[PDB]
Design a protein around this ligand. Structure first.
Ligand code: CA
Length: 374
């Protein structure tokens, strides 16, 4: 255990405490691991060097701990004008283990800086054989980043992010880039320019419990393959929470499979409450999907296939085996259907015991093997 102030950190909202804080981290590391504590206050930091160096470099066994969100604030210095891949991060090309941070706030100060800045970043090597392991983030707030809020990256095994908040960031509040056997729980993402939550790049065996996303510039939560022709994310459980008042969809599932969305409240979104776009074996169970299509004539729940024949994969992602059961669906004045399949090859949808109401038309299926009951 080390108090950054014992290493020269002032936390006066002006002085550059980077070196001090980094010194404390290095001491903990050398001691084989420990907690680096930062008393209440605003600690300014500058880029450590190249983008990949971020601001603060965590290492095996080291954890950061503040006096609580909003109480302890690490903020980028005014005038900073370079790309910073993670104000707090782990080393590229190194498999870092047993580390994290809690009870503090990372402020990207994007109003007074330039360059893509991400709050948190960690991982090994994109496309490389290796991963960070055993990472825990608790009660941390990330805000004002010009880039991503929380960006745990390829590859990270057994990561846990809970009771945290990401808001007012340039891109996505939370990203799950190739996370494995990990968990996102009781987190909140709002006012981000793009997505609240963006699960991408082969992430799998991932659980998202009771997370909330609202007021985001795009989708509340999206699970997608990404730009590259890589193994699709799969085996993901979205259990509970709420995704509402987002610019686009509440929940978007694109070029993915084996996803279960259950017990969630989805409302007030610009587009569809739930959109399945080129995915297979998706289960939409016991959700409250209502009052969406606030900005467009779309259905509360949309099912369609994704044509990527001219894209990276040269594949036509046919949507198959979508189970929609036990949901309560009511539209807005614009909601076209309760549930709709596009006549694009999407097939084998199973609609079972769904209460639909307040829409121009309850259901519309086209798949020759798609069924409806109740
Ligand atoms: Ca690392």
């Amino acid at each position: 255990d080390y108090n950054v102030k014992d290493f020269g950190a002032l936390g006066d909202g002006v002085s550059d405490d980077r070196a001090s804080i980094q010194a404390a981290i290095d001491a903990a590391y050398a001691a084989g691991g420990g907690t680096v504590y930062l008393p209440a206050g605003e600690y300014r930091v500058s880029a450590a060097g190249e983008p990949g160096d971020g601001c603060l470099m965590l290492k095996d066994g080291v954890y950061l701990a503040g006096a609580g969100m909003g109480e302890t604030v690490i903020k980028l210095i005014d005038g900073s004008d370079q790309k910073i891949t993670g104000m707090v991060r782990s080393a590229y090309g190194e498999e870092t283990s047993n580390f994290g941070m809690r009870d503090l706030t990372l402020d990207g100060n994007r109003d007074n800086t330039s360059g893509k800045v991400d709050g948190w970043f960690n991982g090994y090597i994109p496309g490389g054989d290796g991963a960070d392991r055993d990472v825990t983030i608790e009660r941390v707030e990330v805000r004002e980043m010009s880039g991503y809020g929380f960006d745990p990256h390829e590859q990270t095994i057994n990561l846990t992010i809970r009771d945290s908040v990401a808001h007012d960031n340039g891109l996505d509040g939370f990203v799950a880039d190739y996370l494995v056997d990990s968990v996102f729980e009781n987190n909140v993402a709002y006012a981000n320019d793009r997505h609240g939550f963006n699960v991408v790049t082969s992430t799998h065996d991932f659980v998202m419990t009771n997370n909330v996303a609202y007021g985001n510039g795009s989708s509340g939560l999206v699970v997608q393959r990404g730009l590259e022709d890589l193994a699709l994310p799969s085996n993901i459980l979205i259990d509970g929470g709420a995704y509402y008042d987002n610019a686009r969809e509440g929940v978007l599932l694109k070029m993915t499979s084996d996803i279960t969305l259950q017990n969630a409240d989805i409302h007030g979104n610009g587009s569809s409450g739930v959109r399945v776009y080129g995915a297979q074996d998706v289960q939409i169970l016991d959700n409250q999907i209502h009052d969406n299509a606030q900005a467009a004539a779309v259905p509360e729940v949309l099912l369609q296939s994704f044509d990527d024949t001219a894209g990276a994969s040269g594949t036509y992602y046919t949507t198959l085996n979508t189970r929609i059961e036990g949901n309560t669906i009511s539209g807005s004045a614009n909601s076209t259907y309760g549930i709709q399949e596009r006549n694009d090859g999407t097939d084998y949808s199973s609609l079972i015991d769904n209460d639909i109401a307040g829409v121009q038309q309850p259901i519309q299926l086209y798949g020759p093997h798609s069924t409806v009951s109740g």
